[PDB]
Amino acid sequence: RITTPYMTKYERARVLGTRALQIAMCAPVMVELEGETDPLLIAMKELKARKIPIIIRRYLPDGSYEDWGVDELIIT
Amino acid sequence: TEGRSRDGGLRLGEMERDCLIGYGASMLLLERLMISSDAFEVDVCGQCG
Amino acid sequence: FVLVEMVDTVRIPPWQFERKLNDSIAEELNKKLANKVVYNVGLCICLFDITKLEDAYVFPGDGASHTKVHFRCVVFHPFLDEILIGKIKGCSPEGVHVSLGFFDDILIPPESLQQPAKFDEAEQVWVWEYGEEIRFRVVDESFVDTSPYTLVGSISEPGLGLLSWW
Amino acid sequence: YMQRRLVKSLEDLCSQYDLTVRSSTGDIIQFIYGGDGLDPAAMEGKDEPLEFKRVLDN
Amino acid sequence: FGQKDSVCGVSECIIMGIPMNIGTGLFKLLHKADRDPNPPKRPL
Amino acid sequence: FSKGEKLPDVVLKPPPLFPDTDYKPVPLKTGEGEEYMLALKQELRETMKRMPYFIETPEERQDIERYSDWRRLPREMMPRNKCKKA
Amino acid sequence: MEVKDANSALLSNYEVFQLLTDLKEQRKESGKNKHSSGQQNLNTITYETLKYISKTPCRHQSPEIVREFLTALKSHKLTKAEKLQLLNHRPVTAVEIQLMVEESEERLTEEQIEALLHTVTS
Amino acid sequence: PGTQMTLKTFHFAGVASMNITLGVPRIKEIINASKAISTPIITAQLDKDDDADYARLV
Amino acid sequence: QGRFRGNLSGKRVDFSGRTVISPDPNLRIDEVAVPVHVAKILTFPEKVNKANINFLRKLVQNGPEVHPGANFIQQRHTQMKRFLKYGNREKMAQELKYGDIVERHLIDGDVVLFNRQPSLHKLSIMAHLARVKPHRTFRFNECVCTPYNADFDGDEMNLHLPQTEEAKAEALVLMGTKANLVTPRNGEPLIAAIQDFLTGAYLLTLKDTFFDRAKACQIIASILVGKDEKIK
DNA sequence: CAGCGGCTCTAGTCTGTCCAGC
DNA sequence: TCAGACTAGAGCCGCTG
RNA sequence: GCUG
Ligand SMILES: [Zn+2]
């Protein structure tokens, strides 16, 4: 819980990138997409509704780790 | 290959590499400089290396 | 039969993300370790339980989910002290072939130890007389890959007497 | 030539989750980045994060 | 010297084709599957 | 091209060779002792056993090994016939 | 796929049979033709395996019997492998225990062997 | 910035004398960490700075 | 030219293009005009799934010669590629399965990398949303000339099409122009107004300017294009 | 009275000198 | 072409015994 | 050699 509450730009880019690849590979979409044919556009819509099934594991330099849910982290 | 006559393609130099590091773009640097150039597989023996 | 604790890195492809993991790993691990003898271990059959399933990574490539899975699977491995009951699915002149019922027709008994009326003379004579019992005697498995079977057994038949059938 | 040399030397440094700057081998260069932990691209003032006179008027 | 080289560094990651630790490589993602770890065991 | 034919030779034969089993008569005495002590050094107390076999065996059971005139008189003489150093 | 623990045997025939009977009837609930182009070796082993265990009349064999027979077995001093043989072999008559049964030498006594026939019959 | 430094002149450290390297050769001198450089300059503050008669002694 | 620098540190890449650049102020600052001749060549592998099956069918039907179209089709567990110039494409569209890969042409809204050849800082390479237009040059709004140090005097610039969904996201979120309005160095804006956008704004905002209702409306109505088309 | 040793000094040598296109 | 900061040498004198 |  020591690590920053705000999601970093690097974290957002990877979460969207993995989610888009998962959606492009026929994963379930939780946003009821309306007229979207591009996986990256669908992934960004999921992040806005805070419904992405991914947990970010933040590894401290010593080797200890803390897991933050994508929904829990504040998105700027 | 090297150029327009040979339908060569374009170079990601040592300076463009330095730009992409400063963005923290680890997967794009892997896509550009491995996957879309010279991706390969080797058999490695874990005993003798 | 014996339990064998095993550890595997089981990859669930991302179109199975509806189903629960511990079921959808089990559907994969049955397709990984059924009818396959593991060298120095025995003939795996199916999945007993998944004793510990740890956290589902997702790697920079595939986009799939790779959970390292500790489990227990039941395997077939006679303990060198078992009197089994099989069926003669074949008779060769060097020795009889017994088969456990629809289990594996790969148990090949050598025959030198039963009562001194022993020969198989190629007209399918079982034994010159005085379900079929078997004593599994040695473990013997050969790793197949060699260049750019595999659990065979040797099976005995001592002076059991065999009161019901000769 | 200068740019090649500087980048080769400094490419590794990364700001860590424990608010430290470490090399790849795990040695410390700085215990907190730049003394403040703050990002040069976010400075609304002359090397300072805010300008209070402007913010209160807004 | 028989030196062994840690493939951890940025430049050798680009040479070997593995994703660099800095940036988006510093953390790992877990899938939030509906799973039950340490599930009920079959009694012997 | 003069040698570009095959591996030089499977083996190179030296026209002169070893003399014999040299010192033939007397090493019958040492030669049996070569095999005598090796029969007794292996069957000695000063050896080790493969306890990794027994930790490998989960089949332990009963009835197997895995489960299971000096005619002399007293005297005492302690000589320092030897060195008085180190 | 490294096997961490090579062995751990207490799986009596009934246990494995029962697991297989629940498994066979449970796999078909979700039986899939998508995975047919992939794997089908599992079906064959389970199917045929059920029959060999079925040979032993574990049909009508009960879960409680495992403890009930075991409670009698601990007094006899036979080893765990021996008892598994005793349950799995299910010696129908004295001759198998009298002769076929393991560790006949010394421990037979013509006393507990006779008692075992009453226990095995139970 | 090294590509923006046109190797300008009109620089004399404020003393109409004492020419200095500046621009890219000065950055190059710093980051090389060479043990000797062109025109090394020590600035000495005088304690009794009141008048020129004390400066010319020291 | 040695392996360390020539073949390892910097290497030639595919799905890349180069052309003369020329201005276009009617594009947004995050957009770049890509000519049809480059767009028909630079393909992106779109994986077939429930959201795009009916869209990719129409692209497969158009085929290689019409711009919203496709050059190759690849079956689920196969690695050879069917060149879609031959065969009957209306049959190959019907036999699309989930998990097939359609190598569609570059279309509007693709994330595309855009780069001047000498790079002194990170803003010399940025990601832009492609829009296809007929003329041969690459075109972008002149507010983005200052990061690239471009001057439209026969200048050439490079284009790279990231071939992976993960490479789109890292390009779009981290390297997008809207995320890079300020230089990392001193934190000052580099994408801003330039000549004829400063002079026109200066002369407009001088005190001597007065407009009647007809000329007020005709200057303001210029902004009513694109996403501002719906606003009052 | 003689011998290490470091200093000190020649000078010797190998090592670089932007990105890319045609 | 222009250093350039390494690597041995040749000493040197003077204490160091 | 020239363009970038
Ligand atoms: Zn090897």
GROMACS .gro file of C-alpha atoms in nm, chain C residues 1-9 15-16 23 26-27 29-36 38 40-41 43-48 68 70-71 74-75 77 79 81-86 100-103 133 135 159-160 162-163, chain G residues 1-13 15-16 19-20 23 27 30 32 34-35 38-49 51-53 55-56 81-82 84-85 88-89 93 95-96 99-103:
model
  108
  126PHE     CA    1  -0.212  -4.772  -0.854
  127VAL     CA    2  -0.037  -4.483  -0.684
  128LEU     CA    3  -0.087  -4.106  -0.654
  129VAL     CA    4   0.185  -3.894  -0.811
  130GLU     CA    5   0.224  -3.530  -0.710
  131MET     CA    6   0.309  -3.333  -1.020
  132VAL     CA    7   0.369  -2.972  -1.115
  133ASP     CA    8   0.284  -2.830  -1.457
  134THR     CA    9   0.259  -2.487  -1.617
  140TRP     CA   10  -1.127  -1.791  -2.528
  141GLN     CA   11  -1.189  -2.002  -2.221
  148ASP     CA   12  -1.219  -2.695  -1.405
  151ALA     CA   13  -0.844  -2.999  -1.540
  152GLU     CA   14  -0.983  -3.027  -1.891
  154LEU     CA   15  -0.441  -3.160  -1.792
  155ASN     CA   16  -0.648  -3.462  -1.889
  156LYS     CA   17  -0.554  -3.387  -2.249
  157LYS     CA   18  -0.191  -3.360  -2.142
  158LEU     CA   19  -0.141  -3.671  -1.927
  159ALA     CA   20  -0.381  -3.946  -2.031
  160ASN     CA   21  -0.270  -4.284  -2.170
  161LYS     CA   22   0.088  -4.165  -2.140
  163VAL     CA   23   0.595  -4.117  -1.765
  165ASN     CA   24   1.033  -4.396  -1.400
  166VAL     CA   25   0.681  -4.298  -1.288
  168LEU     CA   26   0.107  -4.486  -1.672
  169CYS     CA   27  -0.084  -4.168  -1.595
  170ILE     CA   28  -0.458  -4.200  -1.625
  171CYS     CA   29  -0.658  -3.896  -1.520
  172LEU     CA   30  -0.667  -3.615  -1.265
  173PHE     CA   31  -0.731  -3.687  -0.899
  193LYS     CA   32   0.161  -2.307  -1.250
  195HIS     CA   33   0.044  -2.836  -0.839
  196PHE     CA   34  -0.177  -3.141  -0.857
  199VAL     CA   35  -0.353  -4.129  -1.023
  200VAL     CA   36  -0.113  -4.340  -1.223
  202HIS     CA   37   0.245  -4.852  -1.150
  204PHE     CA   38   0.451  -5.223  -0.678
  206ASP     CA   39   0.411  -5.720  -0.498
  207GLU     CA   40   0.076  -5.728  -0.682
  208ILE     CA   41  -0.118  -6.037  -0.798
  209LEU     CA   42  -0.326  -5.885  -1.081
  210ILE     CA   43  -0.605  -6.043  -1.285
  211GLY     CA   44  -0.592  -6.005  -1.662
  225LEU     CA   45  -0.546  -5.623  -1.815
  226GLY     CA   46  -0.907  -5.574  -1.921
  227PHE     CA   47  -0.914  -5.280  -2.164
  228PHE     CA   48  -0.632  -5.122  -1.962
  258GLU     CA   49  -0.390  -6.423  -1.256
  260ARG     CA   50   0.236  -6.153  -1.083
  284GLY     CA   51   0.302  -7.232  -0.776
  285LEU     CA   52  -0.020  -7.055  -0.684
  287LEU     CA   53  -0.503  -7.194  -0.886
  288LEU     CA   54  -0.776  -7.398  -0.707
  480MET     CA   55   0.549  -3.142  -1.590
  481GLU     CA   56   0.822  -3.241  -1.340
  482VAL     CA   57   0.690  -3.501  -1.092
  483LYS     CA   58   0.776  -3.369  -0.744
  484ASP     CA   59   0.652  -3.672  -0.545
  485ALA     CA   60   0.709  -4.008  -0.720
  486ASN     CA   61   0.481  -4.216  -0.489
  487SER     CA   62   0.207  -4.205  -0.217
  488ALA     CA   63  -0.009  -4.522  -0.247
  489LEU     CA   64  -0.323  -4.584  -0.038
  490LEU     CA   65  -0.559  -4.574  -0.342
  491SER     CA   66  -0.755  -4.895  -0.286
  492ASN     CA   67  -0.931  -5.034  -0.590
  494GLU     CA   68  -1.128  -4.549  -0.431
  495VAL     CA   69  -0.995  -4.535  -0.787
  498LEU     CA   70  -1.337  -4.166  -0.869
  499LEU     CA   71  -1.361  -4.307  -1.223
  502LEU     CA   72  -1.556  -3.891  -1.360
  506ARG     CA   73  -1.721  -3.581  -1.822
  509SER     CA   74  -1.957  -3.151  -2.053
  511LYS     CA   75  -1.701  -3.189  -2.609
  513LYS     CA   76  -1.439  -2.927  -3.012
  514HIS     CA   77  -1.159  -3.114  -2.824
  517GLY     CA   78  -0.732  -3.247  -3.016
  518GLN     CA   79  -0.740  -3.520  -2.750
  519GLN     CA   80  -0.933  -3.848  -2.716
  520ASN     CA   81  -0.679  -4.080  -2.546
  521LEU     CA   82  -0.836  -3.988  -2.207
  522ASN     CA   83  -1.170  -4.136  -2.305
  523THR     CA   84  -1.024  -4.477  -2.393
  524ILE     CA   85  -0.821  -4.523  -2.075
  525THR     CA   86  -1.102  -4.425  -1.841
  526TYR     CA   87  -1.364  -4.640  -2.025
  527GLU     CA   88  -1.159  -4.967  -2.039
  528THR     CA   89  -1.005  -4.902  -1.691
  530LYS     CA   90  -1.409  -5.257  -1.669
  531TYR     CA   91  -1.092  -5.411  -1.516
  532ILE     CA   92  -1.176  -5.263  -1.174
  534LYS     CA   93  -1.400  -5.735  -1.276
  535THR     CA   94  -1.341  -5.716  -0.897
  560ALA     CA   95   0.118  -5.290   0.088
  561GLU     CA   96  -0.006  -5.627   0.219
  563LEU     CA   97  -0.391  -5.311  -0.011
  564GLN     CA   98  -0.329  -5.652  -0.169
  567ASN     CA   99  -0.766  -5.517  -0.388
  568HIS     CA  100  -0.708  -5.893  -0.436
  572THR     CA  101  -1.117  -6.830  -0.070
  574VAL     CA  102  -0.623  -7.086  -0.073
  575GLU     CA  103  -0.538  -6.742  -0.209
  578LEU     CA  104  -0.094  -6.968  -0.055
  579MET     CA  105  -0.132  -6.673  -0.298
  580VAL     CA  106  -0.126  -6.415  -0.014
  581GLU     CA  107   0.206  -6.232   0.046
  582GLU     CA  108   0.427  -6.286   0.357
   0.00000   0.00000   0.00000
